[PDB]
Symmetry: D2
Subunit: 334 residues, 4 copies
């Protein structure tokens, strides 16, 4: 239905493409990176994390060919030269990781695009959205550069929403044991973050995260009530959020879990899931939801302090949300 | 000085041996396991985590020879047959992981030993000790089966003591992002804990930890106030404790860090350490302290909820504490 | 059609079960291990390597239930008490790793089974078979305890057969860069093989392998002409054989590759595959063939010496061959 | 004694710096990279692979301060702006990986340096040297841009030299199971080499190498007789060479090992080592020799074909050879 372009055909760019392949209302007509079609096709076909792409992939000139459909391949380092308008691209998924500033992402609009979805926390964006939490705040008239936040925020926000509405969150802190990403390093290389500069597959690497405070962007009532950190570990994909919060209402483990299960079946179905199985990260590789409560981990002290653990495939879940947001934004008229 | 025997020459047994080599007051004269001297000598000399042992290691008959001293090698799976008495062994380090219950650990006493140190949380032990927290409670007359707790409790207890004494802990929850251990599995094998049954180097594995509740054993005032869990990750060694606690007094990050640093350079020197550097797990491999505060991670919300993160080499640190405890127990008379 | 029993429901045991689910001619009616039905069910449903099993799995009493079919679960350490006869099991897949000697595997026969397939190299087996190479040598009247060799031998034999037949192998050496298995150790632990005793996910570990010499059992003309070793590395599954051989004829890379593809498309279709794609180990996870030639790696030096590289999913490919062998054996009369 | 500059303060650059701190004849007065002094100092102080540097490290403006010594820090992307001459730098270690072509490496000469050592195979270099094999071929008057070959070639050449002199090599093929390096990728990213584009810590990754070919550069008699490949695996450091060669005469494992042991204790002392211990990769971390024979792995088939396996710490060993070459080149006059 709506024509979409993807700038930065990497981990999120390609997984967003995989997700788009399952959404008939979304059509990816062009992608942009810093290599050639042959390379992007090879990477799209064979994935070290999600296996071979269950589709036909080939190349024809500067175009990828998936199931007969041709996708234009561009290699413009400067997004202002993408000429999105000429090929009718309305929504651009900005996932290079280099253009999170509005002034930069806005270059896509200058190139003829209508809307831009930054696949990460942004700066000076017109608004930040987390599907299932605040998409109703999207304004087609005033919002052109939208942030889909981070995978961590998309995992926490949904169940933070439930805990707050049902029991009221006074204050809380979280840690996300997160798999490594391409923003880290193989073997001790320069990095603005001296922790992320260290060999990713050899250590537990503490690093900051704005996910806790970013939750306030989608749930204003939580402003100043949350904070947290991250710990990158030697796993290629799938992460988990560990939240410890003080509640206004006195609760039991059963009550907390019941409320999370109810939200997973109702308001947040497809966004928040609920599991009573003793699973591990590998089990969630490929999961499309944004957050899956690990019910067995739920605990409470004095009926006022609770710990909630939730899984999330930082690649697949987030990419699906990006597509859901694309379709949602389009449904409001471009 | 004091004659020591080690039952279960594994990760702790061997690292305890390395630490013993550095203390003139403790002499390891015999070790017991389930293999021959050739095998134990090879494992002792070459370590995948701690490098080559800086000492001369050889074999005479079926006994070990380290720096000119002969170490008797036994291979009895039933501790009752160890005859520690015949060779003047007074203190036995029980580190097989199979004899944490008093009925099993006491067999060493039945066999001639005077004191037994269980290298883990125990059952029906005379007392559980964490050096730097409650070794003063040790009574040579009434205590014969002693537990040195777990590495996690040895990491948490030291700073929980500082936090409670200086600000007062109302309640709190912790999570330890822990390296995998020999209790886990290489590739999905049967295990009582269905999570620990899964490929250890492939996932983030949520599992239990008695550390939080065990802290009450050495700090009774914290009874019923703490709880937690563990996340086993793909690293071979070094772990980290993440504590989120509600304090009684209002505090600032600087006040919390100052108290921890004071204790680290004061009363808990050698046990608790304090670091303001942005380091990673590999950097703590070989660390001999029981707990190192990652000061850069300390945070506070509403001046009441605090997060404290502490590193610990679960093998080296704990092993050193086992030896310190042995020397301490010996100093009180056998 | 034929009722099959699996002794040792581990990596091979369970992956053989998966393969059997896709073969209407073989029905697994019972499995034996050292744990309960709940544990085996959990392990069968969630695999850290091959993902979630696409089938309904539940427990009923002390039995398993897969897609409405009930699978009997036993927990007999001694195979002689399995009572295969009483439940009509004619073929037993011996995959515990503890009964590779004929006298031990034969205990299944005393228990009522008619044929035993040892899922590994054996001792005193009536015959060793590699599907696609010598199944024609199987004699229903004289062969009751059959070995399906190792995964490495199943990978090498097929193309060693092609090379010898087309160009004649004078002599050769092979090395298999093999993923770790459950016969190794998580962290330096006693092991008859001092190399396999070392932390499996931490090093490149040289270890012996009888695959090269075993090829002689399925290809007699190669007796005394091949030898090799293995190198265990930090990967969970998928291995690769590296064969260097002196040939009788002088050849070119194109000639060698062409002959391998001819065999893959004809004589050994389904057993030997041919690939001209620049892939990596992850890409072969799930591959059901016994051997896939990495054509881009083929190399020839000074006309007479060649290097051929072939991939193989040591779990999936081998398990499918076990099932193919069971079906083949059954087609000859039980 | 001789003033040295390091271009590309990375894995080799920093480890070369470590080796130089041990050689009184080599004085590193400046290093160049693409970051700030604080970052380089931090990376030099804490190494994820080799541990904390045993020296005092601090920063003073644009200088590193190691044990009171001032080390100038530059950040010039273009080698021609380095002005080595102005600071008396005579020998430059080119270890960025971007200037292996003579035309590029020569830029250091234009900037005032007298000699350039390319820490890798090069293009149109004046000469390629492997200490212990052909340093005697270095000509101070004609050789200004020298290559110290690869770590792999430094491992193979020394023992290939012994085998050829003692038995005569007809032809041979090699494979080096190599730890991953910074030229690879964390998670499937564009790369000219489609194999190296794949997640490095997740697969066995075949990749080409001219190491066996480069041997002819230092041992001209082996021209056209060798070739090989590489296999990158999930280990951070330490690699191993696996050579299979056809000899001009029949030999036994004992004779091959005896000749290798003799050379390691004689002519190649310090370059070639010999071990009869059953070790693994982690055991060689820190090894300063270029090649250590794993005697237990030596094999021979049909009298004329041998397999020799040798270990090498690709970072430490090679870095030491770089320093050795610098001292050697200086001793010949600048
Ligand atoms: N990986 C995750 O788990 C995850 C989850 C949620 C959000 N994100 C966010 O998504 C963004 C991308 O992350 P990723 O993990 O996919 O990174 P990545 O490194 O895998 O992909 C980035 C891609 O963009 C390309 N690129 C870089 N500069 C370019 C330019 N100037 N023009 C065109 N293409 C260019 C790169 O070649 C690469 O293919 C980041 O902002 C990140 O924070 C990542
Ligand atoms: N690894 C850590 O981080 C850590 C830290 C603190 C405490 N611990 C505790 O220490 C104990 C041992 O742990 P580990 O990691 O050293 O385990 P391990 O598996 O590495 O070592 C156990 C050793 O005991 C031997 N053994 C087993 N049964 C025996 C028996 N019946 N008789 C004699 N020897 C026997 C084994 O062969 C092995 O060498 C456990 O109770 C564990 O919880 C572990
Ligand atoms: N894993 C591979 O890549 C591979 C490939 C080809 C062949 N094999 C061979 O297959 C065999 C099994 O290998 P694996 O990797 O599946 O091993 P594994 O350790 O994963 O499985 C062995 C199973 O047998 C069970 N067991 C042990 N003793 C038993 C007994 N006495 N009675 C009943 N059950 C028992 C264990 O609990 C476990 O579930 C070995 O002989 C091995 O050499 C392995
Ligand atoms: N790592 C090994 O095992 C090994 C062994 C022997 C030789 N080598 C070779 O040594 C070279 C470097 O390898 P490495 O592993 O140290 O790489 P690395 O990526 O760790 O280090 C390269 C360094 O150079 C810097 N750099 C890049 N371009 C630069 C420029 N234009 N100017 C100044 N600095 C620049 C990078 O910031 C980095 O610090 C390569 O040619 C490689 O093939 C590597």
């Amino acid at each position: 239905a709506v024509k979409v372009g993807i700038n930065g055909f990497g981990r999120i760019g390609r997984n967003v493409f995989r997700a788009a392949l399952k959404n008939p209302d979304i059509e990816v007509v062009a992608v942009n990176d810093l290599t050639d079609a042959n390379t992007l096709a090879h990477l799209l076909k064979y994935d070290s994390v999600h296996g071979r792409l269950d589709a036909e992939v080939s190349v024809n000139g500067n175009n990828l060919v998936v199931n007969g459909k041709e996708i234009i391949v561009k290699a413009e380092r400067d997004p202002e030269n993408l000429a999105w308008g000429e090929i009718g691209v309305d929504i651009v998924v900005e996932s290079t990781g280099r253009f999170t500033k509005r002034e930069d992402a806005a270059k896509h609009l200058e190139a003829g695009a209508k809307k831009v979805i930054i696949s990460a926390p942004a700066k000076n964006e017109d608004i930040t959205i987390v599907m299932g939490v605040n998409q109703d705040k999207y304004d087609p008239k005033a919002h052109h550069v939208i942030s889909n936040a981070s995978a961590t925020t998309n995992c926490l926000a949904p169940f933070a929403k439930v805990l707050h509405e049902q029991f009221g969150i006074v204050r809380g802190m979280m840690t996300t044991v997160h798999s490594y990403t391409n923003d880290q390093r193989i073997l001790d290389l320069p990095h603005k973050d001296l922790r992320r500069a260290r060999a990713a597959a050899e250590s537990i690497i503490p690093t900051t995260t704005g996910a806790a405070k970013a939750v306030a962007l989608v749930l204003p009532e939580l402003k100043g009530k949350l904070n947290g950190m991250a710990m990158r570990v030697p796993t290629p994909n799938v992460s988990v959020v560990d939240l410890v919060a003080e509640l206004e209402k006195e609760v039991t483990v059963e009550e907390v879990n019941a409320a999370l299960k109810a939200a997973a079946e109702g308001e947040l179905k497809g966004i928040l899931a609920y599991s009573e199985e003793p699973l591990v990260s590998r089990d969630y590789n490929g999961s499309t939801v944004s957050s899956t409560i690990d019910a067995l981990s739920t605990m409470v002290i004095d009926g006022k302090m609770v710990k909630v653990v939730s899984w999330y495939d930082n690649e697949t879940g987030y990419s699906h949300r990006v597509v859901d947001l694309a379709a949602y934004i389009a449904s409001k008229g471009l």
